[PDB]
Design brief:
homodimer; about 220 residues; mainly alpha; all-alpha NTP pyrophosphatase fold; two-stranded antiparallel ribbon; 10 helices; binds 2'-deoxyuridine 5'-alpha,beta-imido-triphosphate; binds magnesium ion; hydrolase
């Protein structure tokens, strides 16, 4: 697949997931159940979650090494919400072509970097830039995307890694919606392992959408 | 006590807590253990925590009522970090006098409001304003304070409530620092109750700093 085709495929999957999660015409701002949708909030909130993967707190557990696998899933979570924002702002090929034209995107398709603990305050500054942009109004989507890819590169992702991990988390997101996430009946911890970690384990063995879903269903039945 | 004396007292307590947590001259940007201090980050991160007290997620547990007691402690957490920022920006009476002169502060000293579920998206917008301001650079402290008091009023606090709850959480913060919070040895959940909830229970019975600390020490020994 070309890079544009990868992007198109992600947009298609995001569209489908958002239709299932929110009902059709979620682009107009409300779920079927009448919850207000703010992709700006989803983004800055997920950024805060990403910040918590690092030892940013000067007063608490001040020596802990980063779990970069956790960081990778967070970067993927943010990407789900950025895709959603693009879709809302509103022809997947057209949007993919625009994303592909962001200058840093070419750098993002290269071989990945291996970050270390030395890189955390730089990473944190980049996340803070995104939180600032998305918590304000009238920002430029292209600038958002640039900053995001710069961050993703710092965190050791490239397009290949993003796509693989995105496909997996997209499955888990669909799974949750089919299993009571909205009504609060879903159980997130399965015999002591968080669903995201069951997923991370599954993503060690090169599977398609439907097979990932089956493996999740099988682990969940044991909860 | 006058309102300025209350403010002065909060600044004094924050100073003492920050000296104990961070060592002297934390105002210069680093703890004794060499962790970088960013009060801007402490503020926007605590704002994100406050947002999580509400049913903001359109896709998860979409019917849950707000626990306003939890909201009150979060507003108090934010206040610890705003006090810290003021101290760093840098004579407690002088700073208290400046805070007292913020126009909305007079409104904050009046009888409190009883918020309901109708008030959440307005509250969320105000928190978002604070996240935006503090995640950027060169903002005005007075404008921060105004926005904060407006939020606090929306969330059902006034100066009396803020002060009482602040004193209590300040004790718990000192307690954590004396009991391994930095080195990660501290245990946050005590026979199934989070330390913040043990505190909230203690704050039902009108106690001074030292007596609160003793009650915490007694519950913690059972963990
Ligand atoms: O309309 C939506 C809503 C959510 N999402 C997905 C994107 C993201 O991957 C995911 C985040 O879900 P949560 O915030 O509910 N939980 P997370 O997986 O972040 O875990 P945790 O409970 O560990 O914080 O929700 C969508 O894609 N579209
Ligand atoms: O230098 C500091 C560092 C922290 N603090 C306090 C302010 C705030 O009340 C408190 C927040 O502590 P945490 O973020 O560690 N935990 P919280 O109490 O917010 O609970 P939880 O674990 O429920 O998220 O730390 C200071 O006052 N000065
Ligand atoms: Mg999340
Ligand atoms: Mg997440
Ligand atoms: Mg906190
Ligand atoms: Mg808190």
């Amino acid at each position: 697949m070309t890079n544009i085709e990868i992007l198109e495929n992600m947009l298609k999957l995001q569209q489908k997931l958002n239709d299932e999660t929110n009902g059709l015409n979620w682009e107009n701002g409300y779920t079927k159940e009448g919850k207000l949708i703010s992709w700006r909030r989803c983004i800055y909130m997920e950024c805060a979650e990403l910040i918590d993967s690092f030892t940013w707190k000067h007063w608490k557990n001040i020596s802990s090494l980063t779990n970069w696998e956790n960081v990778r899933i967070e970067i993927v979570d943010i990407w789900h919400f950025i895709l959603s924002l693009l879709l809302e702002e509103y022809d997947f090929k057209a949007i993919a072509t625009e994303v592909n034209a962001v200058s840093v995107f070419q750098d993002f398709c290269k071989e990945e970097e291996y970050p270390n603990e030395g890189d955390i305050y730089g990473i944190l500054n980049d996340i803070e830039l995104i939180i600032h942009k998305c918590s304000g109004f009238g920002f430029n989507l292209g600038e958002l995307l640039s900053t995001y890819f710069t961050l993703a590169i710092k965190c050791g992702l490239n397009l290949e890694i993003l796509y693989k991990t995105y496909i997996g988390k997209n499955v888990l997101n669909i799974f949750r919606q089919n299993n009571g996430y909205k009504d609060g009946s879903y159980k997130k911890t399965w015999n002591g392992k968080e669903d995201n970690e069951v997923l991370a384990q599954i993503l060690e063995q090169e599977l398609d959408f439907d097979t990932i879903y089956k493996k999740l269903e099988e682990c969940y039945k044991k909860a």
